[PDB]
Design a protein around this ligand. Structure first.
Ligand SMILES: OC[C@H]1O[C@H](O)[C@H](O)[C@@H](O)[C@@H]1O
Length: 444
């Protein structure tokens, strides 16, 4: 039909993505309903939002002294760090990022945990500081049942991991074993989640930071809570504890069933761990690109794109990276240059037309717009829980960093839903979870 006609079809199909402020008020409303259920013993096991207490009760003040190691696992890239704190000056740091072989993440646990040690050792040798004894802060980006900071148990693998022999085990001991099998003098290991690590890096700088948001390969938030409410923590002594919400799991009990579309379902169905992390799959960087691919492939079989031809590339899963959604977003009205280049250059689509470019940039915008707003609802929900009148939020993640308009839009959503008397501000966590995990390690 007319190009205009074809475009109007794309609008009608992608309409279920065009959510209203009222929709978000509700997601947020239902979300908050789940978090308070997860803090309750009689209702945690029937809630998707686990609210795992991290046992980090008091955030690092800066007086911490010493030199510690710090690993980062789960995020976009494996960082091996070394921190020196003296409170005093700014914590000295040194670091590396090691690529991990695709196999390592799906084979045996001992094999992955062996790789971890294999790697750290190199760092220690090259920097000429091996025999020195340390205290490692392990930022393990996954849901774990914390039994104190040192003993952490994997609940389940999220994201792109599926190593056997890890789930249900104490990860700190796994690492500690392999470290020993490499003659490395690694005394302690504090297991901290990335959100928790972020909240710490953030508190160390800003005294008002009570939240740690991660919007990268995956989404999750952590916040300071009243330890009188964290029932699974038992009758404790300190007033507070950093809670690892692990909200990626929202929707796992049918809470987002009215807002999830067919693209969300066929993307989910075909994912690594089907049916798990339903809210995350609508928000994070590992899945947003896959959403536009799914829409496309659908649009192509309806003859609404590429005259019905699907390119070899877009047949392979993850062939349409979220990174593309970055350049595509800088496109003005009468200007589909970045979109165009993407179809032809990154995806090698054979024959491409203006309608295709236009249709595709709209698919991106839709997906990316709802993504930000969803995280935004979530922070508005946290702010409604924390209740403090001045909340500094520590952020991190490719989405926040590399995406034009992401934080720009997220904030607008937190703005329509935050407590009218709360003043908040997103403060990017520049030095990562490393500097934050090390201060935590300083006590272990
Ligand atoms: O990377 C951020 C988040 O990714 C996934 O959601 C993990 O399950 C979660 O533990 C982590 O915090």
């Amino acid at each position: 039909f007319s190009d205009q006609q074809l475009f109007e079809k794309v609008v009608e199909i992608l309409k279920p993505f065009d959510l209203s402020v009222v929709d978000y008020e509700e997601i947020c409303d239902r979300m908050g309903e789940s978090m308070r259920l997860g803090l309750q013993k009689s209702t945690n096991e029937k809630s998707s939002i686990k609210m795992f207490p991290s046992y980090v009760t008091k955030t690092p003040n800066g007086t911490e002294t010493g030199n510690f190691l710090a690993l980062d696992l789960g995020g976009t890239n494996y960082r091996v760090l070394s921190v020196t704190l003296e409170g005093g000056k700014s914590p000295r740091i040194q670091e590396r990022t090691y690529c991990i072989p695709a196999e390592k993440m799906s084979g045996s646990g001992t094999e992955l945990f062996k790789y971890i040690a294999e790697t750290l050792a190199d760092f220690l040798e090259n920097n000429g500081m091996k025999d020195k004894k340390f205290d490692l802060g392990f930022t393990f980006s996954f849901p774990c049942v914390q039994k104190g900071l040192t003993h952490a148990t994997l609940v389940r693998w999220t994201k792109g991991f599926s190593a056997d022999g890890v789930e249900g085990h104490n990860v700190a001991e796994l690492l500690q074993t392999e470290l020993d099998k490499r003659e490395l003098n690694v005394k302690c290991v504090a297991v901290v989640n990335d959100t928790v690590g972020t909240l710490a890096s953030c508190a160390l700088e800003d005294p008002k930071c009570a939240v740690g948001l991660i919007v990268g390969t995956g989404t999750n938030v952590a916040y300071i809570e009243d330890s009188s409410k964290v029932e699974l923590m038992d009758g404790v002594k300190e007033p507070e504890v950093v809670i690892n919400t692990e909200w990626g799991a929202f929707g796992e009990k049918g809470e987002l069933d009215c807002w999830r579309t067919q693209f969300d379902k066929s993307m989910d169905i075909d994912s690594l761990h089907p049916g798990k992390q339903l809210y995350e799959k609508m928000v994070s960087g590992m899945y947003l690109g896959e959403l536009v691919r799914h829409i496309i492939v659908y649009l192509v079989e309806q003859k609404i794109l590429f005259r019905g031809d699907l390119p070899e590339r877009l047949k392979v899963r993850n062939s349409l990276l979220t990174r593309y959604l970055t350049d595509v977003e800088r496109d003005p009205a009468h200007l589909l240059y970045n979109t165009h280049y993407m179809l032809t250059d990154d995806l090698h689509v054979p024959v491409v037309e203006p309608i295709d470019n236009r249709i595709v940039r709209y698919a991106c915008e839709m997906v990316v717009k709802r993504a930000a707003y969803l995280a935004g609802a979530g922070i508005a929900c946290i702010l409604r829980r924390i209740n403090r009148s001045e909340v500094t939020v520590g952020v991190d993640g490719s989405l926040y960093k590399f995406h034009p308009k992401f934080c720009e839009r997220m904030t607008d959503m937190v703005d329509k839903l935050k407590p009218k008397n709360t003043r908040f501000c997103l403060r990017l966590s520049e030095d990562g979870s490393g500097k934050g995990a090390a201060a935590i390690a300083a006590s272990c």
